[PDB]
Write a protein that binds this ligand. Structure first.
Ligand SMILES: Nc1nc2c(ncn2[C@@H]2O[C@H](COP(=O)(O)OP(=O)(O)NP(=O)(O)O)[C@@H](O)[C@H]2O)c(=O)[nH]1
Length: 35
């Protein structure tokens, strides 16, 4: 969507599973919100 709208911040995979636990287990643990 950010290709169509400059007003969308892109979030990459590692920006979403960013927690130290998530990295340690290699899964999502926390809900993440993106726009
Ligand atoms: N071959 C292939 N692998 C994919 C595809 N989409 C995601 N993956 C791979 O599958 C693995 C899991 O993706 P991920 O997005 O982290 O899964 P999840 O459903 O978010 N995780 P969890 O249930 O822990 O939240 C990753 O290694 C990713 O590269 C796809 O289209 N093709």
């Amino acid at each position: 969507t950010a290709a169509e709208n400059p007003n969308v911040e892109v979030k990459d995979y590692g920006d979403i599973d960013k927690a130290p636990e998530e990295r340690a287990r290699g899964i999502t643990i926390n809900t993440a919100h993106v726009e």
